[PDB]
Amino acid sequence: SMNAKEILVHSLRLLENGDARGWCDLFHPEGVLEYPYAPPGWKTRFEGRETIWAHMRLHPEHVTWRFTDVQFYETADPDLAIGEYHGDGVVTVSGGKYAADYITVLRTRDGQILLLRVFWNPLRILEAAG
């Protein structure tokens, strides 16, 4: 099955497709999603596939995303990936823009995600959403 880097690039393509169900299905049932720099007001951790789903569920209808090519650092374990990439987000009703630079840590096992730890600058969110 897929290694961490192939799962990251496939997870991004899923999001660009609006396919939240499939994105969430990549996680291990006890999969963890983390936003370590999220703003106060926001949860920085979502434990378990269903919890991640309950958060991601709602957004494809309202915002869509396009990511540049991931550049990966060379980790020793093929079940760990660490990557940098740029996302542009578009709010579907207004044409409102998000622009973000990520560095993301991904731990996989047997094709499923145990941990997706997604860093980005929460100023990018406060400027676009307030």
Ligand SMILES: C[C@]12CC[C@H](O)C[C@H]1CC[C@@H]1[C@@H]2C[C@@H](O)[C@]2(C)[C@@H](C3=CC(=O)OC3)CC[C@]12O
């Ligand atoms: C919190 C967030 C903020 C912007 C908008 O309100 C949509 C929400 C939902 C979903 C969330 C964005 C921030 C974004 O930067 C994300 C973290 C971004 C991701 C990057 C990635 O690797 O996985 C998810 C896509 C969409 C995202 O999952």
